[PDB]
Amino acid sequence: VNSFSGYLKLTDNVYIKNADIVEEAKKVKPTVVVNAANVYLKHGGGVAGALNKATNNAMQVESDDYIATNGPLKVGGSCVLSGHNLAKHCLHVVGPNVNKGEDIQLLKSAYENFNQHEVLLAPLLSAGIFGADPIHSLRVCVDTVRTNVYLAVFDKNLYDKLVSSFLE
Ligand SMILES: CCNC(=O)c1cc2c(N[C@H](c3ccc4nc(NC(C)=O)sc4c3)C(C)C)ncnc2[nH]1
């Protein structure tokens, strides 16, 4: 039903909220939830671990069957699979891991995948252990994505820093 509420409007198409993406998916019932994935779709940590545990591991079981038949994704690439109990679909997107020297320019490629979907619930890509500067990730999202994106950031200090920086 895409019933998003309580978001700050950053641009005509980008919205942001201090919220847990799992709880937002349960409340909103979005058509598409984005996972911040890795190339072999191993959902052990970060956002991916939270989304997978909220599906009682159904996302990992499906991802393993996909990888066995199709092989790993490319950095900057994506894959639509089932959204299970969280959404109709999950768009698994691979942002670059700048802590491992992957090219930060591929963060643009990663957000470009959002343009195939009219409306998405998403986390900030390449944050956590992937090491991209969160303000830079938000700017690449705003400059790249043309469709409607609702960003859930589950850290109040980071949310406030991102909003303050973007409003300068
Ligand atoms: C209680 C269950 N929920 C959570 O643990 C949870 C966590 C959470 C969340 N975390 C953000 C985050 C953390 C790690 C991380 N690792 C990444 N790696 C790749 C491959 O891109 S991207 C990424 C993003 C923080 C920056 C805020 N963002 C929204 N919703 C959430 N929910």
Curated annotation (Swiss-Prot):
It is a multi-pass membrane protein. It catalyses: Thiol-dependent hydrolysis of ester, thioester, amide, peptide and isopeptide bonds formed by the C-terminal Gly of ubiquitin (a 76-residue protein attached to proteins as an intracellular targeting signal). Residues 1-168 form the Macro domain. Changing S164L: In strain: Gamma/P.1. It is found in: Host endoplasmic reticulum membrane. Inhibited in vitro by GRL-0617. Coiled coil: none annotated. Changing T31A: In strain: Mu/B.1.621. Responsible for the cleavages located at the N-terminus of the replicase polyprotein. Participates together with nsp4 in the assembly of virally-induced cytoplasmic double-membrane vesicles necessary for viral replication. Antagonizes innate immune induction of type I interferon by blocking the phosphorylation, dimerization and subsequent nuclear translocation of host IRF3. Also prevents host NF-kappa-B signaling. In addition, PL-PRO possesses a deubiquitinating/deISGylating activity and processes both 'Lys-48'- and 'Lys-63'-linked polyubiquitin chains from cellular substrates. May form homohexamers. Interacts with N protein. This is Papain-like protease nsp3. It comes from Severe acute respiratory syndrome coronavirus 2 (2019-nCoV).
